[PDB]
A paper describes a structure:
In humans, a major E3 ligase responsible for generating K29 linkages and branched chains, TRIP12, is central to cellular signaling and human health. TRIP12 regulates diverse cellular pathways—including cell division, DNA-damage responses, gene expression, differentiation, and small-molecule-induced targeted protein degradation. Here we utilize biochemistry, chemistry, and cryo-EM to define the catalytic architecture producing K29 linkages and K29/K48 branches for the human HECT E3 TRIP12.
Higher-resolution insights—including details of the active site—were obtained with a truncated version of TRIP12, termed TRIP12ΔN. The other represents Ub linkage to K29 on a mono-Ub acceptor. The tandem Ub-binding domain organization is observed even in the complex featuring mono-Ub modification. The positioning of the adjacent, vacant site, ready to capture the distal Ub in a K48-linked chain despite its absence, accounts for the striking preference for branching off chains linked through K48, rather than other lysines. The mutational data also agree with our structure showing this ARM region binds the acceptor mono-Ub for TRIP12 generation of K29-linked di-Ub.
Residue numbers in the entry:
A (entry chain A): 484 to 755, 762 to 799, 866 to 984, 1131 to 1156, 1165 to 1285, 1305 to 1358, 1373 to 1380, 1388 to 1415, ...
B (entry chain C): 0 to 73
C (entry chain B): 1 to 75
Write the structure that this text describes.
């Protein structure tokens, strides 16, 4: 202000040097200013003086600052653009005739900054032609600014005002084929806005498009890699759709210019149907364009109801039809493929409309030779039985047209695939809905009365076979072979299996146990496994091992069941707002609970209620306000719960949003009506004495139930197939528990149970921001994820876990990380910082996890004498603590003692536990001192809390655990058998197996009654194993390898004999797997549940938790995968020399150098699932900047680990690169000295 | 390896240790991590100019012990 | 006057040095004998970072002493 007046007086002067000094001072004052700092700055007086100063001719230096002053004034105070916009004539005059290029560039920058809010003034000022008249003389930035000005001016245009762009259209059209990204983007925006504004004027559209714009944009859309981005691709395709719809002549013109080839290339790919994966919006826009290029349907006939559910192309079709025939033949296949592989209410509807118009406007032969290698009848039958009264009408119309055009071909297919049956069902079983119901009824009645009125070796045969699976009647094994023949070699349909009761009968056959059944369940299961799969018949088990090979019939049955389930399912997918949710806020009223009244009565009325706020905020506000006392105070605010909230008879959890609290316990009413919340202040030890062990559980017996499990609530027409598939998967996983001797192998790997439609629906539902942000995921998805997880792959279940297991902030962060494409979502998370020392890492880690281990905020770890902080040290913390937890001194796991490779100064000589099958806990007997047990238990508790915290923060650990460990984690420790000893102790398992080879012989020989006591005794004593008898072995009741663990009391003077050997084996297995490793896992479970419950890990199998906790499996890299995600820039544009040498040199390691490189760059010696392509910041490679004296050869590379930024010198050889990339990775580790 | 000083209006001195080939956006992210200001309200000023994203420090000839300014926008 | 410089992992380098020798000369000798440039070497004695612009006599560094070398590369 005070200096502002002095500067204004300096501006209003005569001496040129005074003006120059004043303008430099004013620019300097404006640059560092701000809205608060520069309050009261005179804009009504400074601006006119600056304009008068700019209106000169005698100097080429004062103007470069006069323009800068106005630019900076607009930048600093975004409200001076009401007095600033008065020298548009002056800027345009300077643009008209050029004297200094820099003055023109600055004028362009000022105009670009002004156009964001005032474009109409520039438009009536005639700047559109003036900016582009000398477009070829400026530099890159001035050209970009000029095109931005053109776009912003053409955003708001009127039909009356067209001469401002009429003479400038050819320049932009010729500019549309440049190699610069941003110029192309701006020109395409200009064209899109022009077309949108001129949509109701056919003549103006013809003027704009002409015949060169179409050509240029057509080859713009095809070039790969794409110059355009996704959003601009969508905009350009929408421009095509709007242009074709509003004027049919350009639709004809594009149809005559082989647009079909471009659409085919965009959809499927290449010109030699594997569709290229694209976002739903792009597919919707392309389908809309395909639909628009086709003639429109008549408004009479059976199409009269479309008026209630809410030319030139036809002339060309009546003309030479070769073009139309080529179009239909080229596009029908891709249209059907898109329709059958997309789950969305818009894409499906658009594809359906396109299919109707294609079928209607084609003739007999074209439909005959297009609809050949396709299944249309099944789709029509599936879509008839739907709740929405749009798809039903579409299906009826398709059926009518197909019957009229091709009666002979489509008269057996409809009967075999259940279309006539569904039409008869519709024709026998507040005004628009009634009218469309009446139309549906009349149309179905007419169709039935006309086409299928008066009227087979597969349906009858299937009925005969399924009538022999009744429980009350014996069926032998002929029914099963008949069913196998029908399933494997026939043309049975999904409707026939429904009509002839097969799934229910088979389910009852496999999963029934009563007293009126004519055959026991065990014999039935063994007959099933003998017919499908090749297990022995009941009562005929061979002496050897049951290891059948063939599994084809079970796979065929699984595939048929999956197809039937896909055909029959009718699950809903809800996708669709954000601005409304982020703007409006909820309203609530507080009323005291009548039963108890001790706190003060509320009288304020409405309460500040954010939609995503937690009830903890309400409790804190009540405590601070003084209602909690039985002025604002912070002592109470600065855990123990003193107040509680209730709604009706339902308790409100503390970790619940107010929106969900209103929605569930108490829609337009949620955001309109006022709600009320009440507030109120808050044994003989048999194992040790006798020697008996608990029995082994059979996991299959809980799956073999006919009724649905208690977790299933939804009602769908495909529940029976889901239950049957669940039973079959249970049989496939657990079939060796039914035979005494069998090999532990799955009949069918679990990757072959994946359904291709439920996965698509789940993936689509897991992309809508609003449902993730509110928490409205449909019940069927979670219920199927927890009950039948084999339908979905691993990524879908992982995303579902991360979305439904934690708060909304973590869900939104995961969504943003996975889908970078996206009223804007913005997560808000807290962060806690802690400092550690690299000399007592375990103790300080334990303290950290005891204090902030269970908190709901992100944790970042910094070090004492280092200047690095962020996401690198945090990952290194886990990577080092996990390595520390494997020391041999602690005495926790099994295995051998090894020494690490490339250690630190003090890490040398430290023994680490190594095991080539994984890590499992050591057994502790009944004589262990309490101190040792307590130490082991506290270490295990810390480990459990560490993993539970690492999972929640999206970090990765480096601990190679074993399969029995995860079985214990998932509460499956009661079903462990001798097969699992190969994962803990290879050498004991062989002895156990050879000894189990003797008990079977002993039992078999004792089962023979044609002998005497002396003969029995001699035969039992004669049994030998590898030349030595059980007495010659000379063992005892001590667990093998550990001669201090007693199986039972007195196990030192009790030798194992042939009479008591089964007890010895059972005790050995139990003490090795469950008994001695119980106290050490109870502490782990207690620690893990301190963060979040273990019950949220039910989406995964024991063999899938390794990828969730640690990284992906090791793999050898190659240049192909490296040159698809690595992004080189800043001196190393692609196909350079340094990048080539580097890509050659990484793909030669042995996973140890891979670990070193990953630790050096990323900070953790692991990668997320998916490899390099899954890293959110791609590995960026840049050129290191040196001087002219020092050679850029005897230096070392550098890395910013927070963003994977690799700075790399331009070496003169590959040997030098090899010898100077290893020194950095080996001698430059465990340090953050540059941040 | 060079050290620079970032100074705010209230009066501080954040000593950032960076390298010439670093991106300005990374510097703004580090300032966010060290002070908490979101990396969208910042407007760095050097030699009476306004630094722009997408460039490197070596483009503007930033050297040892060069003082920048951090002016926030609302 | 043959002080020992120890790298991170296990390497020890003998280095002949004069009493009134600056840190720059020691860094240059280390570069000659090992190859690490005298820009990314950070010498630590006892528990202190050896500043540049003084001599080993100021830090009470004598014969048969051990120094630690840590590289300035990561961030």
């Amino acid at each position: 202000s005070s200096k502002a007046q002095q500067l204004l007086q300096g501006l209003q002067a005569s001496d040129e040097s005074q003006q120059l000094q004043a303008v430099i001072e004013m620019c300097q004052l404006l640059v560092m200013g701000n809205e608060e700092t520069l309050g009261g700055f005179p804009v009504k007086s400074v601006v006119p003086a600056l304009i008068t100063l700019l209106q000169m001719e005698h100097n080429f230096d004062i103007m470069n600052h006069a323009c800068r002053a106005l630019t900076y004034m607009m930048e600093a105070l975004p409200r001076s653009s009401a007095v600033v916009v008065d020298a548009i004539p002056v800027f345009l005059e300077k643009l008209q005739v050029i004297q200094c290029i820099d003055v023109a560039e600055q004028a362009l920058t000022a105009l670009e900054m002004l156009s964001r809010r005032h474009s109409k003034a520039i438009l009536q000022a005639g700047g559109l032609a003036d900016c582009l008249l000398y477009l070829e003389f400026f530099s890159i930035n001035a050209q970009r600014n000029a095109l931005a000005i053109a776009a912003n001016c053409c955003q708001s245009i009127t039909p009356d005002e067209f001469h401002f762009v009429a003479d400038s259209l050819p320049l932009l059209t010729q500019r549309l084929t440049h190699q610069d990204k941003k110029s192309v983007e701006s020109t395409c925006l200009c064209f899109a806005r022009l077309v949108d504004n001129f949509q109701h004027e056919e003549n103006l559209l013809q003027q704009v498009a002409s015949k060169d714009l179409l050509t240029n944009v057509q080859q713009l859309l095809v070039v790969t890699p794409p110059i355009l981005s996704s959003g601009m691709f969508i905009m350009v395709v929408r421009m095509f759709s709007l242009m074709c719809s509003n004027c049919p002549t350009l639709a004809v013109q594009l149809m005559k210019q082989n647009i079909a080839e471009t659409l085919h290339f965009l959809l499927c790919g290449a010109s030699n149907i594997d569709l290229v994966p694209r976002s739903p919006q792009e597919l919707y826009e392309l389908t809309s364009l395909i639909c628009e290029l086709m003639p429109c349907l008549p408004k009479e006939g059976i199409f009269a109801v479309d008026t209630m559910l809410k030319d030139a192309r036809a002339q060309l079709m009546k003309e030479d039809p070769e073009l139309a025939k080529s179009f239909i033949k080229t596009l029908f296949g891709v249209l059907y493929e898109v329709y059958s592989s997309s789950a969305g209410p818009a894409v499906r509807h658009k594809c359906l409309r396109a299919i109707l118009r294609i079928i209607y406007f084609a003739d007999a032969e074209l439909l005959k030779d297009v609809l050949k290698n396709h299944a249309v009848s099944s789709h029509i039958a599936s879509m008839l039985s739907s709740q929405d009264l749009k798809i039903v009408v579409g299906a009826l119309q398709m059926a009518e047209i197909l019957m009229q055009k091709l009666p002979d071909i489509f008269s057996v297919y409809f009967r075999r695939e259940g279309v006539m049956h569904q039409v008869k069902h519709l024709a026998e079983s507040s005004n628009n809905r009634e009218k469309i119901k009446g139309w549906i009824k009349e149309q179905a009645h007419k169709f039935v009365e006309r086409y299928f009125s008066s009227e087979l070796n597969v349906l009858q045969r299937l009925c005969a076979a399924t009538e022999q699976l009744n429980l009350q009647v014996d069926g032998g094994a002929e029914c099963l072979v008949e069913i196998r023949s029908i399933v494997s070699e026939s043309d049975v349909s999904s409707f026939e299996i429904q009509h002839s009761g097969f799934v229910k009968q088979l389910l009852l056959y496999l999963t029934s146990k009563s007293e009126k059944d004519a055959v026991s369940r065990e014999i039935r299961l063994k007959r099933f496994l003998h017919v499908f799969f090749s297990s022995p018949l009941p009562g005929e088990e061979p002496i050897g091992r049951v290891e059948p090979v063939g599994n084809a019939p079970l796979l065929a049955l699984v595939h048929k069941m999956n197809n039937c389930l896909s055909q029959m399912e009718q699950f809903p997918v809800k996708v669709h707002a954000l601005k409304f949710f982020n703007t409006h806020q909820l309203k609530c009223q507080l009323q005291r609970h009548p039963d108890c009244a001790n706190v003060k009565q509320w009288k304020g009325g409405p309460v500040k209620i954010d939609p995503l706020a937690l009830v903890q905020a309400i409790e804190r506000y009540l405590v601070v306000r003084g209602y909690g006392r039985v002025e604002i105070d912070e002592s109470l605010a600065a855990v123990r719960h003193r107040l509680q909230f209730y709604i009706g008879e339902h308790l409100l959890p503390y970790n619940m949003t107010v929106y969900q609290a209103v929605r569930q316990f108490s829609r337009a009413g949620i955001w309109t009506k006022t709600h009320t919340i009440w507030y109120k202040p808050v044994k003989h030890d048999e194992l040790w004495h006798d020697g008996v062990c608990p029995s082994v559980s059979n996991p299959l017996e809980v799956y073999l139930i006919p009724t649905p499990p208690e977790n299933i609530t939804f009602e769908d027409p495909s529940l029976d197939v889901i239950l049957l598939l669940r039973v079959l998967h249970a049989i496939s996983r657990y079939w060796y528990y039914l035979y005494d001797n069998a090999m532990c192998k799955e009949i069918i790997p679990t990757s072959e149970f994946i359904n291709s439609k439920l996965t698509a629906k789940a993936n689509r539902q897991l992309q809508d921001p609003l449902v993730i942000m509110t928490g409205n995921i449909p019940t069927w998805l979670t219920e199927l994820g927890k009950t039948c997880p084999f339908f979905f792959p691993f990524d879908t279940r992982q995303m579902l876990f991360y979305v439904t297991a934690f708060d909304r902030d973590r869900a939104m962060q995961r969504l943003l990380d996975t889908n970078p494409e996206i009223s804007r979502v913005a997560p808000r998370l807290d962060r806690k910082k802690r400092t550690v020392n690299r000399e007592e890492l375990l103790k300080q880690a334990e303290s950290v996890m005891q204090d902030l281990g269970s908190s709901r905020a992100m944790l970042e770890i910094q070090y004492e004498n280092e200047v690095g902080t962020g996401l690198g040290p945090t990952l290194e913390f886990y990577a080092l603590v996990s390595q520390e937890l494997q020391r041999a001194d602690l005495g926790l796991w099994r295995g051998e003692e090894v020494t690490l490779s490339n250690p630190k100064g003090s890490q040398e000589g430290t023994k680490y536990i190594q095991n080539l099958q994984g890590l499992f806990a050591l057994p502790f007997g009944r004589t262990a001192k309490p101190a040792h047990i307590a130490k082991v238990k506290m270490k295990f508790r810390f480990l459990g809390k560490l993993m539970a915290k690492a999972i929640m923060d999206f970090r990765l650990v480096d601990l190679p655990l074993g399969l029995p460990f995860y079985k214990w984690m998932l509460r499956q420790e009661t079903s462990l058998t001798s097969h699992d000893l190969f994962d803990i102790d290879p050498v004991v398992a062989r002895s156990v197996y050879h000894l189990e080879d003797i008990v079977r012989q002993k039992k078999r020989l004792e089962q023979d009654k044609s002998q005497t006591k002396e003969s029995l005794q001699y035969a039992l004593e004669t049994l030998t194993m590898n030349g030595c008898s059980v007495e010659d072995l000379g063992l005892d009741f001590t667990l093998p390898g550990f001669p201090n663990i007693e199986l039972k009391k007195g196990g030192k003077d009790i030798p194992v004999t042939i009479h008591n050997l089964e007890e010895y084996l059972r005790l050995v297995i139990f003490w090795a797997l469950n008994e001695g490793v119980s106290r050490q896992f109870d502490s782990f479970r207690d620690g893990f549940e301190s963060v979040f419950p273990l019950s949220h890990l039910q989406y995964f199998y024991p063999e899938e938790l390794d990828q969730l906790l640690c990284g992906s499996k090791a793999d050898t890299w190659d240049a192909k995968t490296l040159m698809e995600c690595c992004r080189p820039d800043h001196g190393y544009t692609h196909d350079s020399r340094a990048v080539k040498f580097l890509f050659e040199i990484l793909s030669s390691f042995d996973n140890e150098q891979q670990r070193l490189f990953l630790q050096f760059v990323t900070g953790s010696p692991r990668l997320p699932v998916g490899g390099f392509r899954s890293l959110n910041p791609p590995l960026t490679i840049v050129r290191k900047t040196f001087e002219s004296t020092e050679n850029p050869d005897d230096f070392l590379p550098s890395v910013m680990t927070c963003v994977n930024y690799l700075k790399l010198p331009d070496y003169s050889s590959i040997e030098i690169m090899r010898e100077k990339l290893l020194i950095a990775a080996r001698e430059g580790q465990q340090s953050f000295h540059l941040s | 390896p060079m050290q620079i000083f970032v100074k705010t209006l209230t009066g501080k001195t954040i000593t950032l240790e960076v390298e010439p080939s670093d991106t300005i956006e990374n510097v703004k992210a580090c300032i966010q991590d060290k002070e908490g200001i979101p990396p969208d309200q910042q407007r760095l000023i050097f030699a009476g100019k306004q630094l722009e994203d997408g460039r490197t420090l070596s483009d503007y000839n930033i050297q040892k012990e060069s003082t920048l300014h951090l002016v926030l926008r609302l």
